[PDB]
Amino acid sequence: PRRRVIGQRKILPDPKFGSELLAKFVNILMVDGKKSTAESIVYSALETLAQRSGKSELEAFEVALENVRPTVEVSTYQVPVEVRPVRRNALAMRWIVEAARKRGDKSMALRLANELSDAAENKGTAVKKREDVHRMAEANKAFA
Amino acid sequence: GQKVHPNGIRLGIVKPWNSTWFANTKEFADNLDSDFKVRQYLTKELAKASVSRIVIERPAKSIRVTIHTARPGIVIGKKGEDVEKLRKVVADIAGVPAQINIAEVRKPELDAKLVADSITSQLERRVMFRRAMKRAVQNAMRLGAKGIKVEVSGRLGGAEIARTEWYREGRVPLHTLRADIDYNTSEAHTTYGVIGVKVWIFKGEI
């Protein structure tokens, strides 16, 4: 990144819904190179999300993730800067997954199903992370 | 300390091995140590003969030692009593029926063992090192020798600090792997201690 401008590698889409967005979500959730376990958790959690909200699968996911995407993010200056779309939903998924690891329910599919459900009416923890980022970039708006 | 031995990195490329026997694990160490004894003996007892290489090979329970030397006459002698004496004692050491051959190294100033042994002999006859090195580079570049580098080192002229002072002429492409670099090394035990003499001789590019 000093010299080298880079390409990017192409991820295989999701084997159930053909969604590269959700494929990157199971990669954000995956730990220790165990992808089968993570996609089991995502299928269970989003399956109960689609059953609970009654909408559908990945539009319930796309709404619950649309409520947590940051708009802009932050001598030592904390300047506000506009987030790129790939970084936008990358941060969305990282905050959903991290907040779901913070929760105190039983299984990971329930922690993440309840976190996406708490983000569908935007009252969970990842929305507090988004409002926190937006308070930082809103307080420091004076630098552009 | 940082350069690879320029014989060892060329062992499959251009340079051959000085031992060319096959052996399983049961007798690999024994054959190898038997080679240390025959090169040790045969190096000590031909110190005057200007010996370059001694190549061992073992075709089916018998050794076949080849002495690449510059003075084959002094190795053989008046009718070859010295050769049959040497194969008698090599047969004593290795425990197999010994053969022995002599290959004449003509152009002895292009062989690095003979050059390093020459400069070492001159240094332990107490001559100044710049003559020995510089004469060696001149007379080696005189006959072929697309490059040569000699490098003595260590307490040179009887000092109390040790220097190196290398010389080179021509091209010695030492990172090129197809270069036929003939490299060898001797030690001069002088009355001030050891003086190390290395010499690289570049002969050709393949």
Binding site: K10, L12, P15, K35, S36, E39 | -
Partner: protein, 127 residues
């Protein structure tokens, strides 16, 4: 008749035989859903057959060995795309464009001396 592809992927090797017929897949005398179709991404042996479809087109007898799960699967994908010399070089326009005829030549990097694994250098103390 009988159409072959070699098809390897990180220490695997998938012989892919194609006859025209139904849409069945026979891998090591075993079905697809029983070989690794109880596991992750059986879709990738079926990806070359969604570029023009396999609905009832061709029975394929495939035989893979070496490697893991994903290694064998990627080997079969490459094996089928090498074995779609059934139809001519037509397919290998679009089949080239999906990135399927590329032999994925990523192999495990060797462990190097003084490193715990291929690049993880052991941690260094104070300075």
């Amino acid at each position: 008749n009988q159409y072959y592809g070699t098809g390897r992927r990180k220490s695997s090797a998938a012989r892919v035989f194609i006859k025209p017929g139904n849409g069945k897949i026979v891998i090591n005398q075993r079905s697809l859903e029983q070989y690794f179709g109880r596991e992750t991404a059986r879709m990738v042996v079926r990806q070359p057959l969604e570029l023009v479809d396999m609905v009832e087109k061709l029975d394929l007898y495939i035989t893979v060995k070496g490697g893991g799960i994903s290694g064998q699967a990627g080997a079969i994908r490459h094996g089928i795309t090498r074995a779609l010399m059934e139809y001519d070089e037509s397919l290998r326009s679009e089949l080239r464009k999906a990135g399927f005829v590329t032999r994925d030549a990523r192999q495990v990097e060797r462990k190097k001396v003084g490193l715990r694994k291929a690049r993880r250098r052991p941690q260094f103390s104070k300075r």
